[model samples]
Target chain A: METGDQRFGDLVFRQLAPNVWQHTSYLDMPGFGAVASNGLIVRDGGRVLVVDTAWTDDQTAQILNWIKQEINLPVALAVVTHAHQDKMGGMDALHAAGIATYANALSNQLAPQEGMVAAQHSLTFAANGWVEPATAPNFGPLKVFYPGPGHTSDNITVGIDGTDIAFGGCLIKDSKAKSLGNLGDADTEHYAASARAFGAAFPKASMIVMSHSAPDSRAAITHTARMADKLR
Target chain B: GSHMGRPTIGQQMETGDQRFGDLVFRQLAPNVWQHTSYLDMPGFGAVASNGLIVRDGGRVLVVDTAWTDDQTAQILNWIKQEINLPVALAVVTHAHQDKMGGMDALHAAGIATYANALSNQLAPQEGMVAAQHSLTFAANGWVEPATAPNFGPLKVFYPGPGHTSDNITVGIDGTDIAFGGCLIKDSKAKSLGNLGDADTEHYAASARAFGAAFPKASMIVMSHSAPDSRAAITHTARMADKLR
Candidate 1:
């Protein structure tokens, strides 16, 4: 839990991993417009898997600048977790620079339902860029199970295989936050059922790392389970 | 007989007849006839939109209203002219604007409209936030669900979200033609408009859940165009969560 909001305020970011660094903005403080993106300059062998393209392409380009400082590896893919306008919103900028964007199956299919037409052909726009639905890499790592449904119809969970780490795509949040849950169809009965189905599918996952919430344990899931169970 | 790919245009489309194009009568029985919805978008205007019409004895039950009144009205009007049968009842599959767009005009001419419950209150006003949809378009003018829906043989049922939350399918038993509504998709565009209203991970699950309760549909008519084998129809709606 850091809630990973390190990219806050006005400060030029220094490289963390190979090309990964966090960037901050003060434009719309308190909102991601001021504090945007979890920049990762992922050097996938000779290629990079730049995940988020951020809200502003300038910030994304700045993050990419760190990549230029080192060996200029081509961005093979952009793994956008969900289809939020703020996250996948800068896709046009990425396409201009030849970077394709990707999200989960639900995000892929559900994007157009929300009326984002750019999703139609942005795949053809990225350079060496791929916008396909990708599974969490099978790297001696994550224990992955597609929880029945959450967030939207496309929520999935990738638990770091034998470790206590789990990458939940907006499924459950961590310790310090009250429900920041963006209720899609998640009211009482449905999400609770989704929580049950999620728990049943990802039986091995103890700790959960949600895309939006603070990464916590089974607390969020259990809370919803209890409330949903009681309500229903 | 299934009409795959591009929807037929002009008169080539079956117009109140025993046989036409790739369609055939009595899919379920010898005397029964059902007009199928062409699954292809064919975009707009040219091919009209998708719905189903079934006939038994002399009465006909129109399950859905197509996009343009003229394109669909001729068919409805022809049933009276050609078969000398009145549209005994009409049922809209779901409450989406496209499914109920021509309701106002139809009601003015005295055809009853039976839409789902939630749609009865919210559908007429569910316009997009786009400026063109808001300012220029009364969307209500062109896209509104039948508010006080009532038509002959109109049967209504509300099945919670399988394709999207609060969905319903219309069943016309006379011809054994039951439209699965838009809850099932026949295509592979995973990134279709399913974006906002679905939890793609469980959409497939939803289809199966809805399927357990789904009636034995002779043929599924997708309000979005293109029909499929029962297996493909439900499986694709579920596979929305699985596509890579």
Candidate 2:
């Protein structure tokens, strides 16, 4: 049986690596029109951890329904990489379904301002925005890191523990993106630094799934830094 | 229709009123609408907050947001479906929940948010959302010039300190409509609503500055009550002067 490229409603699930799947959802942005976003659904034993939700509660519910039917594993926890809707829009659905949600301390504080519901729990990071590896065990194979602000001040990345696959969120651009997508809330001054730090943090993360574009190799990290550098 | 025998300026117009869930949008002038949402404060039950929606050319400018993201989402959805115009920008009058509570919704919809620089700094610290873009102000009092393009046809003015240190007022360039937020009180207000973060010493001076900045404004929108006339500005100044 084919293990990659499965579709459910408005969401698409593609196997990235063993026990790791990337979920894609679509949102109609004001100027950009319909844009696709990516999240992660990571399975470990009988439990699973959702990286981020789809653009809406319905889309996020689809993800939850798929996990229950296809994987037959209870969602142990859920986390959002940032405060943007594309990352946390389905928060209400998750909360309604009684799934414990976790997010960065700053992301939780910023989520309400973006018209999103904040997570029930928070994960604190260093001043430099690094989440210690010691905390990874709590969220199964997921390791979250805030490599400094790029697309948004609270943007973050989630790496699958013991594997090279990682969810870059919106901080890292896709291979097809001609330039850094939206700078409306971007910390352009520190975006390049954040990208470089992300590359240094996970040197072996060759398979990187990013929001708004298809998955790509680690080279996309360098390309992001270069594009952000030109803005300065 | 009139309140207290005074003719209602825009509320009586036949522009119609629409409701989205608990949020309501009341059309004022030809291109201006007031969106009101409620917050259940601990001491006060179901207090209402009002925001303005100004349409210009092909874009729209939103002044303040609802008390929550869900309410703000309804505001955006209504604007998209009925008004059928893309929101060009949004400005939070201050860092209070009544001003910027729905900021996350605006940002998520790809709308740019602009606020006073000080308001941006105080938002997160005050357990609120900060605007993405900001215009720096002097220590206090009228920083943005009247001629500047604050955002489309709207002009933003920070009239020193009043209800909050970062309080600001937004006015339409050509129209007699202005949004005074919580800084100016309605005619029926016997006392200033909440002074938890008030700059009492400079409150009167700020109120007078607001009047001086918008001399032609006839319809002023306040957050906690119905839209009032220029008399509210003088009424607020007199009330603040009594505190000293």
Candidate 3:
């Protein structure tokens, strides 16, 4: 989708909806050089939810400040998909702003595994942190759905009710992708099943924002299903 | 424990990591690793294939995907849960399933993948995706080049054609390691394993070209070998001579 917002210092964001925006930050991965990775900045009611972090602390700070300045709302909460630095690198910045961050316990446990340094105030998603096979409401208007395991064991999709947007943090691929983007810690055998679960649960998602690449719809799941079927 | 339960431990305690059948990982250097998985072909039964994973800081770079997506997932899970690193990048060594079979898994991981333009072009011809063929930086989910693309400490080199039209090698600069993929044969191989796609006429020259390009590599890795060394390149050239 075409972006409608402004770009931050090192972070870039384009609004996808009235209160939902897609943010990206340049992550200088060791072997992949520097690539722009995606995240989400959602404004709900009078509060803001930073679904993922920028690639670095400075960029994270920029995101937080942008929310405070433009949204004129307090950054209510945050959540990270997995322990990858791209999603958690800006944790320190979020903690510094007195904004509490949340992740699945699996994400917290795997944080140090990827050498991800947790923010001082980082906490597990205690409220509605659903690890069950069935999906249910987790936060206000947000439903946490575990669509099996594709990207990672803890990889999940957060649905924003009434907004028609599902932030598939690395679980969903962008439209340009013909295959899964990366599987450094994936469950390949069950990836297709997991994806089908998500597609079944979020059949009405108008826009599904993946972690990297652009926002997409059900094509990502179809592509994943095809790719998974062909995988040896 | 069930698959539903994530590895509850934070730091791995020299865990054996998981393996399927004969597939296993061996530490080659501080950040370098070697692993092999088998492919079950109708006529060939189980054929061995090799892959490499390199660690830099907290992230990793994979040389090839492995023989199958399931194997690729095991490797990814191992690095993430055991070695404790995110696979930031992957390089497809050639167009064959042995080289690019795990590509889909890599895609699911959201890591950037690169392949020789020739391999990329030939992959879909061979009925495959995820290896990402023929594109500029922004075309698709992956990046590709004609030849000589560097990703951090890893440098990809196209050493002529032998096993496949797009066969390439990867060199870990500081580690002095060169991953020959399937371009170089196993040291014990009496004859070339699969010539279905081999450029048999240019096999010798291809091996020689790779040897010249990576002369400084202390550890030379091959797709199907017990122990990789510079000798395997020479062995391949020698076998090519007998083939003619």
Candidate 4:
């Protein structure tokens, strides 16, 4: 029989800095949800902040295996960058594994609370250009900001311990350039500003990693400033 | 998805078809040949976007390049040997590598290339982040010159940002074939949605506009659908959203 360790697999953690590392694992989430995305691990000894999670049991196992090797302490928390399943599809699995989740209050509050599959399909097809989902996973341990809003008045950004890195969540990626550069899983109106807030909220932070692609400090900051703009 | 091998000039594919690698090339019209290749590898081209070989005037219009460098080379080599036109122009349906990855190789041969105005915007950030799509451009081979190529009979237009922020419609007016690109999602697409902050609404609108704009199209080419379906506009316009 293939042991959990040998069959499922884990990831190799490469330290990019003193406390920051890139946990490389096969993104088993492909075709399940989010289609094309990545997962990262940022920790400080006892506390671990997984940037995002994927869909498959194998993917969750891969992260668990990697966490087994990387973290010397327990996972203090986790964050879903935005509402997109690619960004948060692995929430249920992570939650099932006993990990907590944090989402942007605005995105969470305003996102589709029902008919996840239909909503995802319409949004991806009619609103955006993606496929419809078959089903939805559960959200594990997630904390939110007050009034349940920020970018979309329903999104959330997370702050962590030790390391100054704050997950962009879904507030920064602009919605206009169609977001290949920086996708916004955030509130349409507040996305830009909240992105900068995510940056400024963690004043001592060194780097800000986003869900998709983001501009460097300069351009993204501009988008953050432009968050006040509304949709036509 | 089973992976088949294609025979190359120096490194020929072994397990696949011997005639023209896997799928043989057949002529559909003057200066154009329809390429028939099986797509079982769901990992890459099997999705909403696939690959196509365009032969025209003895030159091949390598529409959208595939992921593997070998695949791009094989498609290009086959066009060279099997057809007389050779590769005159490399048309990128969009910034996607499924259609344009081979540009680098073709660029090495000094083949002229062109992308939509918006595709130019998306190309620079190829592998910056969760940048999916096998992004090996100039880093491996081929390069995008400071300027873009001007097509003779084709033009790329973005009525709006529907599918992607950089979505554009390639008007192959000469062939009356509009490569709808993945800007318009297939009806059966699974879980594909618009990314936050992108121009999905635009893509939807453009899909409709493209339908009206290219009413005369004879054979439409979709990056991921049954080959040579009805007119591009018919299939594209009849999508769930557009028709609805």
**Chain B TM-score (each prediction, in order):** 0.63, 0.89, 0.81, 0.65
- TM-score (chain A only) of candidate 3: 0.87
- For candidate 4, write residues A92-164 as lDDT tens digits: 6676677765543212322343111111111111011111121112212222222112443323444444654
Over the stretch B150-204, how does candidate 3's per-residue lDDT look in tens digits? 3677766656546764577777879878888887876777887777666555567
Q: How accurate locally, in lDDT, is each candidate?
A: 0.46, 0.79, 0.68, 0.45
Provide the lowest-lDDT 10-residue window in model 2 chain A: A127-136
Q: How far in Å is the alpha carbon of B133 misplaced in model 1? A: 40
Of candidate 4 chain A, the 10-residue stretch with the lowest lDDT total is: A121-130
Give candidate 3 regions above 4 Å deviation: A1-3, A119-138, B1-244
For residues A24-63, write the lDDT of model 2, one tens digit per residue.
8988878878898899998988898999999999999999
**DockQ for all models, in order?**
0.03, 0.01, 0.01, 0.02
Q: Candidate 4: list runs displaced more than 4 Å.
A: A1-232, B1-19, B22-26, B35-59, B128-150, B184-199, B228-244
* Of candidates 4 and 2, the better by TM-score: 2
Which run of 10 residues does model 2 chain B get worst, by summed lDDT? B1-10
Which candidate wins on DockQ? 1
Q: What is the alpha-carbon lDDT of model 3 when measured against the actual structure?
A: 0.68
The reply for model 2, stretches above 4 Å from the true place, is A1-3, A132-137, B1-244
Q: Let me know the DockQ for model 2.
A: 0.01
Candidate 2: tens digits of C-alpha lDDT, residues B51-88? 99998989999999987788899899889877899898
Q: Name the better of 1 and 2 by TM-score.
A: 2
Residue A162, model 4: Cα distance from true site in angstroms = 42
